[PDB]
Amino acid sequence: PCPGACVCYNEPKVTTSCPQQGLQAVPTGIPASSQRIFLHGNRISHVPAASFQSCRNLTILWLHSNALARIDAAAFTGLTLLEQLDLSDNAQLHVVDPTTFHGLGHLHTLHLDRCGLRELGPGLFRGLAALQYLYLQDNNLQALPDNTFRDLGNLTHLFLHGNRIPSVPEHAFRGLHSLDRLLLHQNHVARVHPHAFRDLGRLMTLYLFANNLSMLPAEVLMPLRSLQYLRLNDNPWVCDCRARPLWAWLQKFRGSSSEVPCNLPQRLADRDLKRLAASDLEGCSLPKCC
Amino acid sequence: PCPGACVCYNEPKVTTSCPQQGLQAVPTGIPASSQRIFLHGNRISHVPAASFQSCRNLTILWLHSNALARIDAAAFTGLTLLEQLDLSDNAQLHVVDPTTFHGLGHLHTLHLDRCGLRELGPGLFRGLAALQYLYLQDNNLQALPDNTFRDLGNLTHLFLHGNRIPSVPEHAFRGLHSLDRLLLHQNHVARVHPHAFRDLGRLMTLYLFANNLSMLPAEVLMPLRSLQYLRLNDNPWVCDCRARPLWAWLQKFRGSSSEVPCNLPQRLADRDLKRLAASDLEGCLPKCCQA
Ligand SMILES: *[C@@H]1O[C@H](CO)[C@@H](O)[C@H](O)[C@H]1NC(C)=O
Ligand SMILES: *[C@@H]1O[C@H](CO)[C@@H](O)[C@H](O)[C@H]1NC(C)=O
Ligand SMILES: *[C@@H]1O[C@H](CO)[C@@H](O)[C@H](O)[C@H]1NC(C)=O
Ligand SMILES: *[C@@H]1O[C@H](CO)[C@@H](O)[C@H](O)[C@H]1NC(C)=O
Ligand SMILES: *[C@@H]1O[C@H](CO)[C@@H](O)[C@H](O)[C@H]1NC(C)=O
Ligand SMILES: *[C@@H]1O[C@H](CO)[C@@H](O)[C@H](O)[C@H]1NC(C)=O
Ligand SMILES: [Cl-]
Ligand SMILES: [Cl-]
Ligand SMILES: [Cl-]
Numbered sequence: 001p002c003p004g005a006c007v008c009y010n011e012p013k014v015t016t017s018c019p020q021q022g023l024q025a026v027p028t029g030i031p032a033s034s035q036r037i038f039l040h041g042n043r044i045s046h047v048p049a050a051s052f053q054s055c056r057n058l059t060i061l062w063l064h065s066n067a068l069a070r071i072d073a074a075a076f077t078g079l080t081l082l083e084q085l086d087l088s089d090n091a092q093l094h095v096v097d098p099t100t101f102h103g104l105g106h107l108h109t110l111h112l113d114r115c116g117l118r119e120l121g122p123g124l125f126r127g128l129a130a131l132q133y134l135y136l137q138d139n140n141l142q143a144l145p146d147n148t149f150r151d152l153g154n155l156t157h158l159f160l161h162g163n164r165i166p167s168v169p170e171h172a173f174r175g176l177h178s179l180d181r182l183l184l185h186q187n188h189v190a191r192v193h194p195h196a197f198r199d200l201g202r203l204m205t206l207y208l209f210a211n212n213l214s215m216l217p218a219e220v221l222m223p224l225r226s227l228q229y230l231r232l233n234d235n236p237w238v239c240d241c242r243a244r245p246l247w248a249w250l251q252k253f254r255g256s257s258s259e260v261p262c263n264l265p266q267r268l269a270d271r272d273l274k275r276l277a278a279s280d281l282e283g284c285s286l287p288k289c290c
Numbered sequence: 291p292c293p294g295a296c297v298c299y300n301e302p303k304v305t306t307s308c309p310q311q312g313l314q315a316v317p318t319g320i321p322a323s324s325q326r327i328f329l330h331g332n333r334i335s336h337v338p339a340a341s342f343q344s345c346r347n348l349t350i351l352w353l354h355s356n357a358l359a360r361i362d363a364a365a366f367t368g369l370t371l372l373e374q375l376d377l378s379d380n381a382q383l384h385v386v387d388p389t390t391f392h393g394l395g396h397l398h399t400l401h402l403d404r405c406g407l408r409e410l411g412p413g414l415f416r417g418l419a420a421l422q423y424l425y426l427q428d429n430n431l432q433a434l435p436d437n438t439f440r441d442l443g444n445l446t447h448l449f450l451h452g453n454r455i456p457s458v459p460e461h462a463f464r465g466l467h468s469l470d471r472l473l474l475h476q477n478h479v480a481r482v483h484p485h486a487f488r489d490l491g492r493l494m495t496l497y498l499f500a501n502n503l504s505m506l507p508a509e510v511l512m513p514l515r516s517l518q519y520l521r522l523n524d525n526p527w528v529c530d531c532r533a534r535p536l537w538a539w540l541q542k543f544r545g546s547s548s549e550v551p552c553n554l555p556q557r558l559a560d561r562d563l564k565r566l567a568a569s570d571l572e573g574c575l576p577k578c579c580q581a
Contacts (some may be wrong), residue, residue, distance in 0.1 A: 012405075064557070088557070089556075089557070096479075113555070113559070135560065137559065137560065138556075157351075157560070159560045181549075210439070229499075229523070229524070235429075256475065256476065258476075258500070275404075275428075276379070
């Protein structure tokens with residue numbers, strides 16, 4: 001029995017589709033044989049505990065563009081075969097309990113973008129060993145703690161752009177051995193730890209533009225063996241003696257890199273660091289070469 | 291009498307080499323029998339017209355990494371057997387007279403990268419039908435005029451990355467029948483004419499990443515029958531109905547391509563267009579948006 005005004009059909013998968021119905025809550029009586037559930041475009045404000053626990057064969061769950069303000073920690077109990085979870089475009093969600101995604105060992109894609117998330121609680125992504133795509137962009141994250149993605153050994157795409165991340169700690173990207181694309185642009189990153197990119201040996205794309213980086217440590221880009229593309233524009237780069245290690249790296253980098261506009265001193269304003277000669281990077285708590 | 295700043299010999303070819311000498315100008319008294327001249331790594335600012343005109347057997351001329359601000363239109367007058375000319379790493383050059391490379395029917399490689407070239411004069415690459423490599427990357431090219439490489443029938447490599455080229459006209463690449471690699475990445479390319487790749491049948495590599503391409507007609511990739519490597523990433527792709535032709539092309543293309551990440555709409559942001567479904571490419575000036 002199909003609930004409400006939803007559409008229930010069997011091919012290509014058993015699907016319960018209830019998009020854009022003004023639903024205030026998850027409808028009861030969803031067929032337990034459902035493999036895909038589409039609840040996007042509604043006004044659902046909360047997801048109570050075990051809202052879909054009868055749908056053991058559920059692989060796809062869409063809840064984006066709702067009015068989510070609270071997701072119960074046990075909301076996804078019994079969904080061991082879930083592969084896709086779309087919770088995006090829920091600007092009033094703000095916080096997800098760190099135990100919410102536990103047990104989702106088959107989860108391959110997780111959409112948490114534009115949800116107003118303020119923090120990433122410890123253990124939020126624990127045990128998601130099959131995760132490949134993590135969308136965290138356009139939130140309100142003001143920190144990127146260590147070991148946040150420790151168990152995500154299969155993650156290939158991580159999107160953190162459009163947040164308020166102030167810095168990149170040493171073990172923020174630990175365990176991300178399969179990461180291919182890391183987009184951190186449009187944040188507030190004022191500093192990166194010297195060994196923060198240790199496990200990113202397979203990273204091909206790294207976006208760091210539109211941040212607040214004045215300098216980059218020495219050999220911080222050394223582990224990036226597979227790096228093909230690098231974006232460092234729109235940053236207050238200080239082009240004095242401290243910029244010599246980055247300048248020498250950009251001359252040897254056989255991949256593609258963007259412009260590195262200098263912000264200080266006044267005479268070198270809007271000058272690409274890659275074009276400059278080594279003689280221009282002379283002079284100056286302060287860096288060691290000062 | 292070899293110049294004191296230079297080292298002259300003739301074991302492979304007659305060579306007059308004076309690199310990294312701080313020379314203010316071209317040294318006088320260069321042996322006329324020279325087949326290779328290396329003036330790279332100095333502070334030469336001007337290349338007069340009477341220079342090198344005696345070296346009728348000159349094949350290699352190294353002038354990269356200098357302070358070149360002006361090169362006379364007849365600087366390479368009697369250099370008919372000149373095969374390689376390296377003028378790169380001269381940011382203060384800016385302009386090159388369109389008659390500079392006339393008569394160099396034996397020139398195989400031409401380095402003009404990192405010269406601050408703001409434009410490409412008409413007939414600049416005229417007659418250079420022996421040219422195979424053309425280095426124009428990392429300059430300030432604000433346009434790509436029609437028939438710019440019309441006579442470059444033997445050109446295999448064309449490097450045009452790091453400029454500010456806003457678009458690709460219909461006949462910007464006419465005559466490049468032998469073109470093998472075409473690097474147009476890191477520019478301001480916003481639109482490509484539907485027949486811009488007409489004569490690029492033997493093209494294998496095409497880089498268009500880091501540009502301003504919101505859409506790209508699938509008809510422009512039809513002539514590229516030899517295409518093996520395509521990079522379209524880092525573009526403001528709009529993945530709606532207008533991207534359906536480009537999408538169907540990526541499904542049939544069995545060569546290695548980069549990701550085509552969607553910039554708009556927001557729900558498809560950072561999603562690879564190749565991995566999307568045709569149902570995702572619906573809705574919305576493009577002709578499919580209005581109906
Ligand atoms: C789920 O799939 C299994 C195997 O196909 C089937 O036996 C079961 O009835 C389905 N529905 C459930 C567990 O609700
Ligand atoms: C991670 O990817 C590898 C490579 O395909 C695969 O063998 C493995 O099963 C994946 N891990 C999980 C938990 O799915
Ligand atoms: C970061 O840089 C932006 C410009 O890209 C600037 O508006 C902003 O004030 C900077 N913030 C800090 C903390 O430096
Ligand atoms: C160039 O070479 C030819 C034959 O090797 C020789 O006859 C001629 O004099 C040379 N040109 C000079 C030395 O200017
Ligand atoms: C173009 O190259 C071919 C061989 O690659 C050669 O036979 C031909 O003479 C060249 N054309 C010119 C004008 O030098
Ligand atoms: C990029 O291309 C768009 C056209 O879609 C244009 O509006 C914009 O000004 C361009 N920006 C730059 C920096 O060239
Ligand atoms: Cl708020
Ligand atoms: Cl560049
Ligand atoms: Cl470059």
